[PDB]
Amino acid sequence: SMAKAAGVKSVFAVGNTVYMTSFGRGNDAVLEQKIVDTSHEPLNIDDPAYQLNVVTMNGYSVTGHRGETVSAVTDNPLRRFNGRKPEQSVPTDMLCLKPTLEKKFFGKEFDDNIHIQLIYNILDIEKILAVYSTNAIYALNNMSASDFFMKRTTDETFDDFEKKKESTNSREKADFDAFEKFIGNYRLAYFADAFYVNKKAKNVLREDKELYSVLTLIGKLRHWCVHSEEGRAEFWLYKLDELKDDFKNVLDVVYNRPVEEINISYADSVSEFTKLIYLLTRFLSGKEINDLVTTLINKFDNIRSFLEIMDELGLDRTFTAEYSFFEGSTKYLAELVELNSFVKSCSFDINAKRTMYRDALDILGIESDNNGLRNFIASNVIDSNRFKYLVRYGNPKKIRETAKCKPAVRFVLNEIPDAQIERYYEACCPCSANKRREKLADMIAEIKFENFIKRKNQAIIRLYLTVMYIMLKNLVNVNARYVIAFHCVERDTKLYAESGLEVGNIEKNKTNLTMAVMGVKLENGIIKTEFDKSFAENAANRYLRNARWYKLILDNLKKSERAVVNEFRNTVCHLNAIRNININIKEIKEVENYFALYHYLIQKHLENRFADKKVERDTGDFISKLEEHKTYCKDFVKAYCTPFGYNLVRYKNLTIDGLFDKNYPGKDDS
RNA sequence: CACCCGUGCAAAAAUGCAGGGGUCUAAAACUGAGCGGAUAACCUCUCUA
RNA sequence: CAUAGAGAGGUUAUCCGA
Ligand SMILES: [Mg+2]
Ligand SMILES: [Mg+2]
C-alpha cells in the first residue's frame, strides 16, 4: 500500500483525537501529528517524515518526504464503522472482544484503540507457541511409535512420579510403564542436545530426573497452549519464576551448554522464558526455529513500541499483577535476539551414526535376509538434513510405503521447475519435461537394490529424500493451520464466556461457540430454527452480521455431526492424519494440491474409524462420494470445519482452496 | 484473488471506479526460490602400509 | 584386525549468486 510508502506507520484514536506515527529505527514509532477534530498540530519538528496535504473527517491526505515523494490518504479511525448510516467513536475489533480483552490484561476499559493491538500481538505469541509446542509433542509421540505425553503437570515432581511404579492404580502403573518405555526406544539420540550430556570424546544419556523435567516442561507448555486452562494455570507461561527448582536447574544446564560451547550471557541471568523457548527450539526443524524466534522478536518489538508510545502520550499502561511479565518485554526482546544470534538446528549424536543404520536402510526399502555398498548408502543418507527433518516426523517404513503413491510424487515433481528437474534427470539417468517427470516418478516408486566411477547413486538418493521432505513438510504446515484454528476456538470460547455469552461447554461439542454466536440451539440434536434475517442482525460479532454467510454457515452446520467434528479435532491435534499416511494415501486417483491431499488423508481416516458405527445420513453421503470419487469431497470439509464459523475469514480460508495458501492464490467457488 | 471499512458517481437497497486496515486471515511494512568461489572440522568407502 | 599423506566423495558459519 502507498500509505506505508508515504511513511504513516499507525493511526491511533485516543478520545476525540487521532495520532499518526512514522517509521523510526527498526519498529520504533515516533508521533507526528495530533489531529483534533479538523485542526493541525505538529508534534515533531526535526525531520518530519510527512506533511498533511488536507485534513477532513473522511480521511487525511499526506505526502512523503524521507522517501520518494508519494501522496496517500489515511482514513479516520474515529469514523471506522460510522459512515453513510454517533459519527465519531473509537472503533472495536471484528470479534467485539476489545473491552473484555482490555479488562483482562489491564484493570479497566480504555477509551482508545492502542491497547487492543498490544493485546492481539500477545495473542499471536500464544498461537505460534501453540503450533510449535504441538509439533514438538508430535515428534516425541512419533518417536514412541499417548495420554502420558498429553497429561504432564509441572506441579508433579519426579519424587512423586516415581511413586507411581509402586502405586496400585492401573492408570498410574501405565503412566510409569509408558515412561520406562521412553528411556530407550532406540531413537532418543535424535534430540541429543536436550537428552544427552557431555561427560573420552563421548556423551551419555542424562539422568532420568532431567529427562523427566524436560518432558514435563514441554508437555505442560503444549497442553497450556492448547487448552487455555482456568485458575492459576492460566498465568503459567507468564510466571515461570515460580517453577520448581528442578525445572530451573534443567533449563539452566540445557541453555548453558551453547554458552559453554561459545564463550554471550550465561543462563544465570537470562530469563526462564527465553530458556524455555530454547528448550522448545531443541525439538524443531531449523526453519521452524527461525520462524518461531523471528515472530517472537517481531511481536515483542511491537509490544515495546506500543508501550513506548503509550508512555509518551501519558496513558496509564501498568499491567495487572498477573501479567506484570510484559513490563520486562525490553529485556525479553534483547534476550530473544541474543538467542537468535546463535540458535542452531538440533544435532544428531556422532555415535548414533551406528544405531540409526536400520532406519536409513528402511527409508529406502533396501533390506535383505557387499557391506561396503550399504555402508556408503547409509552414511550418505544419514548426514543429509532432509533425513534429520524426515525421520523425526515420519516412520521410515511408512514413508517407503507412501512413496508408492504415484500421483503424490507425480504432483510434487510437477511443482519442481523444469530446469531443476532437467539437472536431476541428467545426473540420475545419463524426452519432454512431463514425460521425464513421469519416468522419474516411476523410478522413485520402484527403488530397490538395482542401484548397486559410474557413481549414479547420489543423484537418485538425493532426489527421493527431497520429494518426501517436501511432501511431509507441506502436510505438516497444512496441519498447523487447523491446529491454530482449534487453539483459537478454545481461547475465544473462554473470552466470550467471560464477556457473558452463554457459550457453555466447548469440550462437549466443539460447534458450541459458533452456535452461541449465531444464537441457534439444539433440540433432539437438530437445529429446528430456519434462517431469518433478525438472527443475522443479532449475531454477537461483526463477521456473522451478513445474511448470506449466516445462511451458509447454518446450512453447513445443520449437516455436521458432533462425533465427526470431535474425531477431526483429535486427528488434527495429534497429527494422526499424517501418522497413518500409509493407509490414508492408499488410493488417490489424482492430487490437485496439498489441501486436497491433506483433506483426503483426514476423510479417509474418518471413513476408516467410522466404518462400523453410528453415522448420520449426511456423513454417509459424504463418505459415499469419497468412495465413488477417489478424491476429497469439498462439502465434507465444510461440515467438519464448522466450529470456525465465528471467524468468517478463517472459516472461508480453511474450506476452499486458493484462499488456503498465501503463496498459491486461485479461483474460489460461488 | 478473501474479509471489513471510508469516500464519489449510477441506481431501487445493489454494481462499477479509487484507497485504507499490527485493532481480519499464517498475513502493517522490512520477502522469498535456485545457486558460484572459502579456511577448518567432519565421516564414508575405495587404495597399501 | 592396529596405525601410519596423497587419494574419491557429504555435511556444516557467510555475499560475488535464475
Ligand atoms: Mg481468538
Ligand atoms: Mg495438537
How would DSSP label each residue in A31-44? EEEEEETTB--B--
Asked if residues A467 and A409 have their Cβ atoms less than 8 Å apart, the reply is yes
A13: the nucleotide nearest its CA (via C1') is B23
Q: What angle do the packed helices A457-499 and A98-105 form, to 10 degrees?
A: 90
Q: Which technique? A: cryo-EM
List bases, strand B, within 7 Å of protein CB.
Answer: 1-7, 19-30, 34-35, 43-46
Q: Specify whether A271 is located in the same domain as A419.
A: no
Dist CA A485 CA A556 (whole Å): 18
Task: Name the residue type at position A142.
Answer: N
Asked if residues A461 and A380 have their Cβ atoms less than 8 Å apart, the reply is yes
Edge to edge, what strands does the sheet with A29-36 contain?
A8-14, A17-23, A29-36
E strand segments, A378-504:
none
The total number of structural domains in chain A stands at 4
Query: Coil, strand or helix: which one is A237?
Result: helix
> Cα dist. A370→A361, A364, A375, A382, A462 in Å?
14, 17, 9, 19, 21
Q: Specify whether A323 is located in the same domain as A467.
A: no
8-state DSSP, A345: P
Report residue A368 as a C-alpha cell. Answer: 535383505
Asked if residues A644 and A638 have their Cβ atoms less than 8 Å apart, the reply is no
Asked if residues A390 and A474 have their Cβ atoms less than 8 Å apart, the reply is no
Q: Specify whether A414 is located in the same domain as A534.
A: no
Expressed in angstroms and rounded, the spacing between residue A93 Cα and the centre of ligand 1 is 11
List of residues 6+ apart from A628 with CB closer than 8 A: none
Single out the residue of A264, A396, A390 nearest to residue A339, CA to CA: A264
Q: Specify whether A537 is located in the same domain as A449.
A: no
Q: Specify whether A596 is located in the same domain as A633.
A: yes
Query: Coil, strand or helix: which one is A404?
Result: coil
Dist CA A435 CA A251 (whole Å): 54
Query: Coil, strand or helix: which one is A213?
Result: helix
Expressed in angstroms and rounded, the spacing between residue A415 Cα and the centre of ligand 1 is 34
Q: Which residues in range 108-137 of chain A are in contact with strand B, contact meaning CB within 7 A of any of its atoms?
A: 113, 116-117, 120-121, 124, 127
Report residue A181 as a C-alpha cell. Answer: 518405555
| CB proximity A305–strand B (7 Å threshold) | yes
Task: Name the residue type at position A441.
Answer: A
C-beta atoms surrounding A346 within 10 Å: 20
What's the burial of A519, exposed, middle or buried (CB within 10 Å: 0-12/13-18/19+)?
middle
What's the burial of A601, exposed, middle or buried (CB within 10 Å: 0-12/13-18/19+)?
buried
* Residue A153 falls inside a structural domain: yes
Q: Specify whether A272 is located in the same domain as A315.
A: yes
Q: Specify whether A174 is located in the same domain as A315.
A: yes
For this entry, resolution in Å reads: 3.2
| CB proximity A88–strand B (7 Å threshold) | no
Q: Specify whether A326 is located in the same domain as A397.
A: no
Query: Coil, strand or helix: which one is A8?
Result: strand
Give ∠ CA A10-A15-A18 in degrees, rounded to 5.
30
List of residues 6+ apart from A59 with CB closer than 8 A: A73, A74, A75, A76
* Residue A292 falls inside a structural domain: yes
Q: Which residues in range 61-80 of chain A are in contact with strand B, contact meaning CB within 7 A of any of its atoms?
A: 72-75, 77, 79-80
Contacts of A229-232 with C-beta under 8 Å, sequence gap 24+, read A230/A494
A545: the nucleotide nearest its CA (via C1') is B4
C-beta atoms surrounding A291 within 10 Å: 15
Q: Specify whether A228 is located in the same domain as A309.
A: yes
Report residue A170 as a C-alpha cell. Answer: 492401573
Report residue A185 as a C-alpha cell. Answer: 526406544
* Burial readout A264-281 (b: 16 or more C-beta within 10 A, e: otherwise): eeebeebbbbbbbbbbbb
Residues forming a β-bridge with A14: A17, A112
The residue from A51, A81, A111 where one domain ends is A81
Domain holding A37, by residue range, is 2-81
The residue from A474, A504, A537 where one domain ends is A474
CA of A70 to C1' of B8 (A): 22
Q: What are phi and psi of A566, to 5 degrees?
A: -70, -40
Dist CA A628 CA A626 (whole Å): 6
Q: Specify whether A543 is located in the same domain as A569.
A: yes
Q: Both ends of chain A: CA-CA distance in Å?
A: 28
Q: Specify whether A161 is located in the same domain as A253.
A: yes
Q: Specify whether A42 is located in the same domain as A134.
A: no
* Residue A455 falls inside a structural domain: yes
CA of A327 to C1' of B2 (A): 37
| CB proximity A22–strand B (7 Å threshold) | no
Expressed in angstroms and rounded, the spacing between residue A336 Cα and the centre of ligand 1 is 25
**Nearest ligand by distance to the CA of A488:** 1
* Residue A450 falls inside a structural domain: yes
E strand segments, A194-256:
196-197, 204-205
CA of A410 to C1' of B34 (A): 21
A542: the nucleotide nearest its CA (via C1') is B4
Residues forming a β-bridge with A17: A14, A36
C-beta atoms surrounding A325 within 10 Å: 18
The residue from A474, A505, A538 where one domain ends is A474
